[PDB]
Amino acid sequence: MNYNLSKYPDDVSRLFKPRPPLSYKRPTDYPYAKRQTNPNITGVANLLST
RNA sequence: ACUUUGCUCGUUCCCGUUAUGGGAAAAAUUUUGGAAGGUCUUGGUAGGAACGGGUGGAUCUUAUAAUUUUUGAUUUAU
Numbered sequence: 827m828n829y830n831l832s833k834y835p836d837d838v839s840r841l842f843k844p845r846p847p848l849s850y851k852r853p854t855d856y857p858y859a860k861r862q863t864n865p866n867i868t869g870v871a872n873l874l875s876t
Numbered sequence: 877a878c879u880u881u882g883c884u885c886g887u888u889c890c891c892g893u894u895a896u897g898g899g900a901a902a903a904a905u906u907u908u909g910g911a912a913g914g915u916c917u918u919g920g921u922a923g924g925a926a927c928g929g930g931u932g933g934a935u936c937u938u939a940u941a942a943u944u945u946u947u948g949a950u951u952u953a954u
């Protein structure tokens with residue numbers, strides 16, 4: 827926070843001092859490329875006989 | 877159901893009589909509604925009503941199931 831990209835003066839921009847940076851935690855879900863619903867939706871015609 | 881008729885019973889009063897009948901009505905009792913008064917409690921005490929609009933904001937319907945939120949690609953799959 828050496829500099830100010832905001833419209834306010836320096837004293838006002840020191841008031842908007844943020845929290846410390848967020849810690850890192852390993853993910854528990856699926857990575858974005860591996861997301862899909864169900865593929866291999868099986869066919870509907872097998873029902874129709876039996 | 878309405879109208880007339882005598883008989884039997886009946887809440888209360890009177891009479892013919894206390895077998896029973898005739899007449900009157902809640903005027904005695906209760907429940908329901910309202911007015912007034914008493915007692916106890918609980919809350920308020922500076923705004924309120926009526927009218928009004930090229931007034932703000934909520935909710936609802938329709939555009940709107942077509943890439944930026946709600947009409948399915950995060951049950952890890954073959």
